[PDB]
Design a protein around this ligand. Structure first.
Ligand SMILES: CCCCCCCCCCCCCCCCCC(=O)OC[C@H](COP(=O)(O)OC[C@H](N)C(=O)O)OC(=O)CCCCCCCCCCCCCCCCC
Ligand SMILES: CCCCCCCCCCCCCCCCCC(=O)OC[C@H](COP(=O)(O)OC[C@H](N)C(=O)O)OC(=O)CCCCCCCCCCCCCCCCC
Ligand SMILES: CCCCCCCC/C=C\CCCCCCCC(=O)O[C@@H](COC(=O)CCCCCCCCCCCCCCC)COP(=O)([O-])OCC[N+](C)(C)C
Ligand SMILES: CCCCCCCC/C=C\CCCCCCCC(=O)O[C@@H](COC(=O)CCCCCCCCCCCCCCC)COP(=O)([O-])OCC[N+](C)(C)C
Ligand SMILES: CC(C)CCC[C@@H](C)[C@H]1CC[C@H]2[C@@H]3CC=C4C[C@@H](O)CC[C@]4(C)[C@H]3CC[C@]12C
Ligand SMILES: CC(C)CCC[C@@H](C)[C@H]1CC[C@H]2[C@@H]3CC=C4C[C@@H](O)CC[C@]4(C)[C@H]3CC[C@]12C
Ligand SMILES: CC(C)CCC[C@@H](C)[C@H]1CC[C@H]2[C@@H]3CC=C4C[C@@H](O)CC[C@]4(C)[C@H]3CC[C@]12C
Ligand SMILES: CC(C)CCC[C@@H](C)[C@H]1CC[C@H]2[C@@H]3CC=C4C[C@@H](O)CC[C@]4(C)[C@H]3CC[C@]12C
Lengths: 462, 462
């Protein structure tokens, strides 16, 4: 007999955690609220009317009532207070404890269920991890960069800066969490406790629910006080208590079935590992590693909520997207005046630029229309963009340990507008295959072994 | 007997979803609150007074009361507690279950109705979709471009990029949801469940409501306890319960009528597919496709709220709108006149403009009446507009990897006012087929391989 809204304290989380609640958690929260309602109703029902009316049996045979002008009433010669005394005594002694304390057992079981549901949200060690993960997930879902990505079928420096900051935050969080294995373990334990709690409530309640009967029969051995051997009592609340007990059993059965579904869902597919196979297969972004424990599980929960969050979060775990972002913001801070002052006119009166150890080629490079020599040193995974057609005066290109991809327009421009090529390489992988389709080259300079085992000079057959 | 604020846990949803509640959902929510109110009232009424005053009948005929100095009272020789006992016994055994458990049945039915109404708001797999859809819908309704468009009959950078971002968010959301089918199916299932629940409730309640009588007659066979065979009872709460049951019947009838209207509205017109036919007539946007399942459904739902939402949202579904947005942002960021400073008189003493790698042709181009040479480089999906007829002095057009389409007026202008054409192409798709219908051409320049395997010079047969 304590209002639901004050018992609700046990069952309430942040609205932020709404993402972390799969459908089974939501269903069990609803069912727990209903269980709490019937616990409160039964408790008030008992407290305000716990009556038990008892009448003595004048003819008693074998500790049992013999059950045998106009009719006249039977006279027992008992005070109202003697009737009250025998009611209290037979309600205390010869009434089954289940019919007495059922609405309190219901409340206690419901509170244990609520505590099991919300423990991992209240426990600080996992509450911190969940709130950190949900904040990161919401920021990734909010970031404009995740909109630009996945859309491949010039950007602002400030947003392009906070996007790299989000990459760093994701990396730090992943490093900090991916070794924990505490959220998964705690969730395992909570579900197991819920299942073995349901599997006990069902047995004991079904076993004892037959003891809630309306017509109780008591023999309390108080002959000195009232003068009657045995009494025939009547527990008026018994029918409504059976109804509430049966309704509670139905609710507990549903709760246990849902918890068994959750337990089975966790016993299969090994939630400690996360695949990301679908995204890397439908976006060609294969560079998304399998996520280890305590981070695979938290992603599996969001998949139960919305696969969209996982998809929009995978973009912040791929190295390809990181490279794209670093190229994109390399262009943001690179103006053209900072590029102009950095340029050098060399000994042959040719304007040159020398770059080394960057993540790629800034696109702002190719607006420096006076440039005549381009040098690229130790830059990985380069692709030549079409804007190279703007460098009408280019004569030399130096590729030092830099493999380069290219498509046809830029290729044609280079076929028609190049005089020299320098290459410094370790092996064949740093030799672009397209060089032999060129036609205006006047100098070629190769630094490295041109031969392989049993394949002498295959590199230069063309 | 739980106050209706605790029950209001089941009966509420976040106001973000007023857009998704048609008038029938609003009416059923109101009716459900009223039914909950009468359930609570009946529950407290029963708990505080579930009395059944019973008096014995001294003259009994055919298991019924014969009902046949100054007047004096009838002496029954029963203690107060024997009266209590027979009240309890006749209330348990000889009072109809409907008259006892009517308010609890009302509470159970109302809870089931509320659950069936809010399930699709609580179910994460559809709750996520509805939240996503409504957020996109509100952003589209409030976005400045939605009123910049539809009015056709120096722009903020932030606004200009968020409009583009909103276009892509609409595209991604449409792709993610349009193959769903789940929201509509689950809504239909909820409505069907409500309709069968109404059909069952009205049946059983009408069939049994006649059993709530005031004067009950009980024969419970307790002579060993009271000495009286049959009793004439009286359920003081019977008339109030009858009027409460009739009020509940009225509410259930209204609820069922509304739910059958919803079922009918869902059954006809094939809500799995939208039209946009009305919108695309008053907008001159024939490029707005029919919308498939799970997206047509929420469009239909919003139309039940305000058709303006769907109208202001349909702009982000037409390719023409995206093209116009890109043209407008392009012309804004590359100002009308900055172009004049950008022009160049070339080596052949012809005034030229060189453009590259844009999304289309800025309309500001065709105010540059001094032009003689136009260069277009790597621009997709170009259609030449009629305003090219303004450029009376045009003598050269260079299309470098820029496919172009055209209609007859601009085409005739170019037929009559062109001397040379240069084309740089990857394959035939970048060759405009109309060139052979030209008449005033003096130079043709093709850059690219004109031949394919076993198909020499088919490209140039014309
Ligand atoms: C609404 C929130 C309810 C809050 C309850 C408040 C107090 C109620 C009674 C107290 C019981 C609560 C559980 C206490 C268990 C110890 C918690 C604690 O702080 O220890 C820290 C532990 C230690 O980490 P570990 O060594 O890596 O894991 C092995 C672990 N010893 C094991 O169980 O192997 O780190 C852990 O890993 C935690 C151990 C696992 C505990 C799992 C319990 C799940 C549900 C428990 C809720 C209580 C249910 C009944 C209470 C309801 C009462 C009406
Ligand atoms: C306030 C919200 C109340 C929340 C309920 C809390 C728990 C109360 C009792 C639980 C009953 C819930 C209804 C069943 C939902 C089960 C969800 C579940 O287990 O799997 C999720 C299912 C997956 O199925 P599917 O892939 O779409 O195809 C099969 C499909 N079901 C079919 O019929 O082929 O996805 C689905 O498709 C869902 C099935 C659609 C059925 C629509 C049910 C609407 C009314 C249900 C409300 C409960 C009413 C009674 C509760 C009141 C108790 C007082
Ligand atoms: C927290 C609040 C929620 C708490 C509770 C919600 C549930 C409320 C109880 C509703 C069931 C009433 C009932 O017991 O029906 C029985 C009567 O027989 C009895 O058991 C009652 C009479 C007692 C005398 C001995 C028998 C059987 O009657 P029926 O007509 O055969 O079937 C009833 C089902 N029907 C409605 C589908 C027809
Ligand atoms: C949750 C709270 C909401 C719960 C409930 C809201 C509804 C409240 C009940 C109002 C109706 C009272 C009533 O029963 O009227 C009848 C009296 O006759 C009776 O039935 C009562 C007397 C019982 C004795 C046997 C008859 C008929 O009286 P009338 O004057 O012929 O007509 C009444 C209608 N009028 C007001 C339009 C005139
Ligand atoms: C959820 C599905 C399975 C419906 C659940 C209904 C079952 C589990 C509940 C509802 C009513 C309950 C019964 C109500 C009363 C009695 C009579 C008693 O002498 C033995 C237990 C017994 C028989 C209960 C057993 C469990 C019961 C049958
Ligand atoms: C679906 C969920 C929410 C409710 C399930 C309905 C069940 C649990 C409810 C509704 C009808 C109820 C039963 C109707 C008939 C009786 C007769 C009564 O003398 C003993 C209890 C018993 C057996 C009730 C027990 C509880 C009961 C079975
Ligand atoms: C606003 C609407 C929905 C209220 C519903 C009005 C009707 C359904 C309610 C209001 C007044 C009620 C009636 C008042 C008169 C009587 C006579 C009484 O001896 C039996 C109940 C009965 C027959 C009631 C039945 C239900 C009743 C007719
Ligand atoms: C909103 C509209 C549908 C109101 C409809 C009113 C009708 C359908 C409802 C309202 C009150 C109801 C009546 C209330 C009182 C009685 C008297 C009882 O001995 C038999 C049932 C009976 C006859 C009910 C039958 C249905 C009833 C007449």
């Amino acid at each position: 007999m304590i209002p639901v809204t004050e018992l609700r304290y046990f069952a309430d989380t942040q609205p932020a955690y709404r993402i972390l609640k799969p459908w089974w958690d939501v269903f069990t929260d609803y069912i727990s609220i209903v269980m709490l309602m019937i616990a409160v109703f039964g408790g008030t029902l008992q407290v305000t009317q716990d009556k038990m009316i008892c009448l003595p049996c004048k003819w008693v045979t074998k500790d049992s009532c013999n059950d045998s002008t106009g009719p006249t009433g039977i006279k027992y010669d008992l005070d109202r207070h003697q009737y009250n005394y025998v009611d209290a005594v037979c309600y205390e002694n010869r009434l089954h404890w289940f019919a007495k304390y059922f609405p309190y057992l219901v409340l206690l079981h419901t509170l244990i269920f609520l505590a099991c549901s919300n423990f991992w949200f209240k426990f600080p060690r996992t509450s911190s991890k969940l709130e950190h993960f949900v904040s990161i997930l919401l920021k990734c879902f909010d970031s404009p960069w995740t909109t630009r990505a996945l859309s491949e079928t010039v950007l602002d420096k400030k947003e392009g800066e906070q996007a790299k900051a989000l990459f760093e935050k994701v990396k730090k969080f992943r490093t900090h969490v991916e070794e924990g294995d505490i959220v998964y373990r705690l969730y395992m334990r909570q579900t197991i406790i819920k299942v073995i709690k349901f599997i006990l409530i069902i047995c004991y309640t079904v076993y004892y629910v037959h003891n809630i009967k309306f017509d109780v029969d008591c023999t309390v051995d108080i002959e000195s006080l009232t003068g009657y051997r045995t009494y025939r009592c009547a527990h008026p609340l018994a029918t409504l208590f059976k109804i509430l007990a049966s309704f509670y059993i139905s609710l507990v059965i549903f709760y246990g079935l849902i918890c068994m579904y959750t337990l089975w869902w966790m016993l299969r597919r090994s939630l400690k590992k996360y695949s990301f196979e679908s995204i890397r297969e439908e976006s060609s972004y294969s560079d998304i590693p399998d996520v280890k424990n305590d981070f695979a599980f938290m992603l599996h929960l969001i998949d139960q909520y919305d696969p969209l969050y996982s998809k929009r979060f995978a973009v912040f775990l791929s190295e390809v997207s990181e490279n794209k972002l670093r190229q994109l913001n390399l262009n943001n801070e690179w103006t053209l005046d900072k590029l102009r002052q950095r340029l050098t006119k060399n000994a042959q009166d040719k304007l040159e630029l020398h770059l080394f150890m960057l993540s790629g080629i800034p696109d702002t490079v190719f607006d420096l229309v006076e440039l005549e020599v381009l040098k690229l040193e130790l830059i990985p995974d380069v692709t030549i963009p079409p804007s190279i057609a703007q460098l009408t005066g280019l004569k030399e290109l130096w590729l030092y340990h830099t493999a380069a991809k290219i498509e046809a327009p830029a290729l044609a421009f280079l076929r028609e507008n190049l005089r020299a090529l320098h290459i410094k390489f370790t092996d064949i992988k740093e030799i672009p295959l397209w060089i032999y389709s060129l036609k205006t080259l006047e100098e070629l300079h190769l630094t490295g072994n041109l031969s392989a085992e049993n394949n002498r000079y295959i590199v230069i057959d063309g």
